[PDB]
Design a protein around this ligand. Structure first.
Ligand code: EF2
Ligand code: ZN
Length: 108
């Protein structure tokens, strides 16, 4: 009965990811970043996620992760901005960067 195994959308409960899918990009699954508007995000990298809607076409503008282009990732149920999908890079080609405090962790 593990209580710390799946991540859901904090706003609505949509299933998003799993602790097992955390990905240590450059040696750490956690990355702290800012956007051009100065908003700070504590980003958890995941190899895999579900339940999202990836919006529009990829962009390399202001990418936090060298060699990757991003798309906004919304909660596919409620529209909450949960993070970004990264693509176009190498080892891995793709991953998800999700905002830790916009997820809730709990049992499967
Ligand atoms: O890797 C990324 C993901 C997108 C992120 N980003 C934002 O969070 C944002 C908000 C408003 C205008 C432009 C941006 C932007 O590039 C950013 O700064 N880097
Ligand atoms: Zn949601």
């Amino acid at each position: 009965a593990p209580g710390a195994s799946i991540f859901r959308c904090r706003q609505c409960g949509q299933t998003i990811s799993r602790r097992d899918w955390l990905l240590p990009m450059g040696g750490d699954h956690e990355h702290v970043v800012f956007n051009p508007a100065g908003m700070i995000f504590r980003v958890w990298c995941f190899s895999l996620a579900q339940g999202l809607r990836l919006i529009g076409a990829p962009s390399g503008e202001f990418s936090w992760f060298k060699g990757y282009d991003w798309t906004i990732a919304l909660c596919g149920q409620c529209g909450s901005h949960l993070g970004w999908h990264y693509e176009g890079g190498s080892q891995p080609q793709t991953f998800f960067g999700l905002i830790k405090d916009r997820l809730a962790e709990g049992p499967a």
